[PDB]
C-alpha cells in the first residue's frame, strides 16, 4: 500500500459539513461559530464523533441517518491522521480553550 490514504475521507467530511453547516445557518451569528467550532473541535482532538454529531444537531441538525454518526468514526482516522501532519506545523497551546464546554 501507499502512505497517505487519509486524504480520502476528507472528501465526505469536508463535503458533508457543508450541508449540515447551512441546516442551521439561520439560528444566529453564533451557530455559524458553533458549526465552525464543532468541526475544528472534533479535529483538535477536543471533541468526538458521538459528541460532534450529538451537538451539531442543535446548530447543524445532525439527527439524520441512524448510521451517520458511525461513519465519521470510520473516516475519522483519515481526517485526524492526514490533518495531523499540517497540524504539527502549528502546534500551539490548546490549553487555552476558547469555547470550554461540559460535553
Amino acid at each position: 500500500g501507499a502512505m497517505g490514504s487519509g486524504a480520502r475521507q476528507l472528501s465526505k467530511l469536508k463535503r458533508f459539513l457543508t450541508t449540515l453547516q447551512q441546516f442551521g445557518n439561520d439560528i444566529s451569528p453564533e451557530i455559524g461559530e458553533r458549526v465552525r467550532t464543532l468541526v475544528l473541535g472534533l479535529v483538535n482532538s477536543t471533541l468526538t464523533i458521538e459528541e460532534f454529531h450529538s451537538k451539531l444537531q442543535e446548530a447543524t441538525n445532525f439527527p439524520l441517518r441512524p448510521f451517520v454518526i458511525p461513519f465519521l468514526k470510520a473516516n475519522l482516522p483519515l481526517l485526524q491522521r492526514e490533518l495531523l501532519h499540517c497540524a504539527r506545523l502549528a502546534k500551539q497551546n490548546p490549553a487555552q480553550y476558547l469555547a470550554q464546554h461540559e460535553q
Binding site: 465526505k12 450541508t19 439524520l64 441517518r65 461513519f71
Partner: peptide, 18 residues
C-alpha cells in the same frame, strides 16, 4: 444510487423512504 452518495449515505433518510 449515485450523486452526492457520500452526502446521502449519511444525510437525509426520510426524504428517500417517503
Amino acid at each position: 444510487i449515485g450523486t452526492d452518495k457520500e452526502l446521502s449515505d449519511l444525510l437525509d433518510f426520510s426524504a428517500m423512504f417517503s
